[PDB]
Amino acid sequence: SYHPKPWLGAQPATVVTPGVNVTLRCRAPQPAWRFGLFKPGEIAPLLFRDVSSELAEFFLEEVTPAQGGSYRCCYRRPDWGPGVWSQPSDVLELLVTEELPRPSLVALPGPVVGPGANVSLRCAGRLRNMSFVLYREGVAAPLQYRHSAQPWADFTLLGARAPGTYSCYYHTPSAPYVLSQRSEVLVI
C-alpha cells in the first residue's frame, strides 16, 4: 500500500545565520501517529514526534552547522509493518552560515562586440532563490538589483555607461538577511 510523501518546510527560511531558532514543519497528506526527520545515510530518525495529526513540528533552537544539511521527513501509522514508513518528503536543505559563498561575475558574449556596445553581465552563485546586487567602484548605491529562481542574475549595461570596475553579491530574499562574500572584481 502506497503512502504519499509528506512536505517539509523551514521557518523563518532554509538559509539562516547561526543562533536563529528554526522550526521544521512536516505536513503529511493524511493524519499519522509518528513523524521522523532523517539525515542522509541514517536508518533510524534523527528526531521524531508522536502527534496523531497531519502536522509535526521540530523546533531547532539556536542553530549551529550541526543542524544544517539534508533533511527528509517520513510519517507512519502503527498498523503498518515493522520498519514501514511513508514515501520520504523531498529534501529540505538547511544552510546555517554567517556568510554565503562568493558568486562569480563574468561578461556574457554578445552578437556585436566593440567600444560603446551594450554589455551583458552574469553574477552566478550555486544557490537558488537568491537576490543579486550589482555595484560599480565609485558608485555608493547598487546599480541594478535582481531576484532570481535560477542560481544567477544577468545585468545589462548600456554602452555609453558600460566602462568601469564591477562587483556583485547575492543575499537571502527574506529574514534573516544572509549576505554572500563579494565577487572578484570585473573590469569592462
Curated annotation (Swiss-Prot):
Paired cysteines (S-S): C26-C73
| Example GO biological process | immune response-regulating signaling pathway
Give all residue intervals belonging to the Ig-like domain. 1-89, 99-188
Q: Origin, by domain of life?
A: Eukaryota
Swiss-Prot/TrEMBL keywords: Cell membrane, Disulfide bond, Glycoprotein, Immunoglobulin domain, Membrane, Receptor, Repeat, Secreted, Signal, Transmembrane, Transmembrane helix
**An annotated Gene Ontology molecular function:** collagen receptor activity
Q: Name one GO cellular component term.
A: extracellular region
Glycosylated at which positions? N21, N118
Name the family the entry cites: Belongs to the leukocyte receptor complex/polymeric immunoglobulin receptor (PIR/LRC) family.
What this chain does, per the record?
Regulator of osteoclastogenesis which plays an important bone-specific function in osteoclast differentiation.
Q: What is this protein called?
A: Osteoclast-associated immunoglobulin-like receptor
Q: Which organism is it from?
A: Homo sapiens
